[PDB]
Amino acid sequence: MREIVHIQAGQCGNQIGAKFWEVISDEHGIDPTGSYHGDSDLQLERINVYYNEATGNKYVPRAILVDLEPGTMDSVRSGPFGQIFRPDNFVFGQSGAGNNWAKGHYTEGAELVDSVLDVVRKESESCDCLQGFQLTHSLGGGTGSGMGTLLISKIREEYPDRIMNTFSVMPSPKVSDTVVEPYNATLSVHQLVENTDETYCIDNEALYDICFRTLKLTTPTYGDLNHLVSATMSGVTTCLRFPGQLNADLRKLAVNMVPFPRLHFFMPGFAPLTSRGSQQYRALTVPELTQQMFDSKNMMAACDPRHGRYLTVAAIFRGRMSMKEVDEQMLNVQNKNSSYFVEWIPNNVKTAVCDIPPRGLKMSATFIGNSTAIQELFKRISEQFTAMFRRKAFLHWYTGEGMDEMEFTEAESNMNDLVSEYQQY
Amino acid sequence: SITVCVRKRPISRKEVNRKEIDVISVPRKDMLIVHEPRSKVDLTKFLENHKFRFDYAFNDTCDNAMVYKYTAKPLVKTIFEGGMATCFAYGQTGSGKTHTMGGEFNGKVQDCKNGIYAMAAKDVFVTLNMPRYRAMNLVVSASFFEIYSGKVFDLLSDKQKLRVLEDGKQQVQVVGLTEKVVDGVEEVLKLIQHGNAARTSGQTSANSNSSRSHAVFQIVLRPQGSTKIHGKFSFIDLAGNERGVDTSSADRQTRMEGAEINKSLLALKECIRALGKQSAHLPFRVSKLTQVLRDSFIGEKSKTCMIAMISPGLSSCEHTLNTLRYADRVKELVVK
Ligand SMILES: Nc1ncnc2c1ncn2[C@@H]1O[C@H](COP(=O)(O)OP(=O)(O)NP(=O)(O)O)[C@@H](O)[C@H]1O
């Protein structure tokens, strides 16, 4: 009825899909060996959303996990997050494309989609209503941006009636591998924007700027930043198995968050902002985190919310708390700041309270915003791309790999049109 | 006082099978443009145009009589004034050199009715029969060399090895060459047909009669009963540099003559530029081919006519710019 087939690819897709499962298996309280040990019926009726069925409180958690190089496939099968899922979804490749978007899309990456699409054709006929396709990948890599963007088109031309969202990861100059990728970026955005519905804009330019200043983690790893992004991805999908006053299914989330005919890159906020297990924090009071959702710093996308006029401000609350104070503290913003949220929607969505607390936080929150502050994550990519391109530098890594020189020009001009589309004030 | 002409040759049948692109255009009477494909640093290919201006330029549809009429035909009213005159055939190998000089390549045979040797030896005799010049009572005699492995051979006699000596008046004299006395034009065609049958040439599939030696044909104009020399017309068919892709089946014998063709032309390339600047010691005695060609450059009564031969295609664009640049340097020469 309300079934979800999940898919992910790439190193960043696989270094968060393990982090995605460990958070939701402790907020729902799921045993990592395959079983379940919980108490509430809030966490028990909704077991058919992601998961299959088997006897003895066991199942197979279906999510297509694929990359060509076998070093990543052997790194997400070690721990208790390894034996949780189906071994027949072990879909790997022969030769990993070395951060080449071209080999992951046309020459080599367009070979083993038939070993991926055959898995999706069997996880579709077993369900009864498929209510989405989710995707986690990096926007500037190899098969994470090559194969992960191609598998959208192979399913969208076969299941066009399904709302598709992608958990996007913009790259950054500070945390960087295969140092130059505005070529890998805008080729991965151009086929994304033309083929998706919802797009969560996560960048490593803001996930490193917070840790340099607020959390004081000056030199972290990917896994320290994988912890930050895996806390929001449970704060988003808590409106899928924990119902409330805002029954906020993904198709209903699609209609309630997309004003203009083209998709836009969502800029989520966060709860009070620490790492795992860190003390020295106050009680998570409701009127305090209103300033922590509308902060100019607490954003999961490096932007400027003081200038970006709000369009959709749907923020999901989690934890047993007072319903009266939630309704009052939101009215200290639109009734005082007419430029931050502006006049497009009468009675815009501003709350959805969940009672089940996350694993480690009591009375937390999850801000999900969308505004014209996402100009600056289009101008900083394009200015780093137009310096790459008006001298035709590093052009020969794609032209000998079955590409076209003038496909850059559309994907350049498609991004410049987005910025001029955002000055609708 | 050297006239320079150029002749683009047409494209063969085998070069159409390998899909060869023609880059040499002769749009006007005395111009030529080389279309050179070049790529920039960012793999953006562009095209260069190398203009040239000569005394006369030949198309690819011109026949050997038209090439004759503008090169060696004006030089017959010079040999009957006391001077001497030569003509070269300078270019890449396979570029139609012995097709112009020797004759039209009729497969297994050599149709010597064409060529510059026969058409001028005919035109000496018509000039000799005019009543203005019949009064001098001259005797036309013909000789015919071969320069192989740096040494001079002979082709009228079968294999007479020849020496290159010098008179006290600074005049090179090959001695002792065979100098038969020519009766008429039916006699001089018997020399050339017998001459080309004995010229040393390789045997392969691409160029089954490729030149392997620098053949020199002379027509000596002598007064009767004096044993002086009143005029000479010395033809020169070269062998042509070959260093592009000549790696087919070359044994120790093939590159023995192979590196000696290229050695003889570098000596010829240097004497052009040494005559270009002034007062330098003109290296005429490096190769014996340059010692024969001494009287062509610094002759006080010498009127030469170099015919620069050009292969048309794309793969020979490198040799083409090499060959055309020397002929422009040959044109810009003032000896005395
Ligand atoms: N103007 C022309 N028209 C038609 N065919 C030509 C022309 N010039 C040359 N050829 C042909 O080109 C082929 C090779 O010509 P050739 O005269 O041997 O070149 P080459 O430079 O003298 N090679 P080599 O003898 O070693 O110097 C022969 O089949 C000729 O008939």
Ligand SMILES: Nc1nc2c(ncn2[C@@H]2O[C@H](COP(=O)(O)OP(=O)(O)O)[C@@H](O)[C@H]2O)c(=O)[nH]1
């Ligand atoms: N934030 C974050 N970014 C990552 C992670 N892993 C990879 N990336 C980004 O993804 C890019 C590399 O893409 P990758 O998946 O390795 O390419 P592929 O393996 O050839 O498909 C780098 O620029 C990183 O910025 C991760 O765990 N966290």
Ligand SMILES: [Mg+2]
């Ligand atoms: Mg020849």
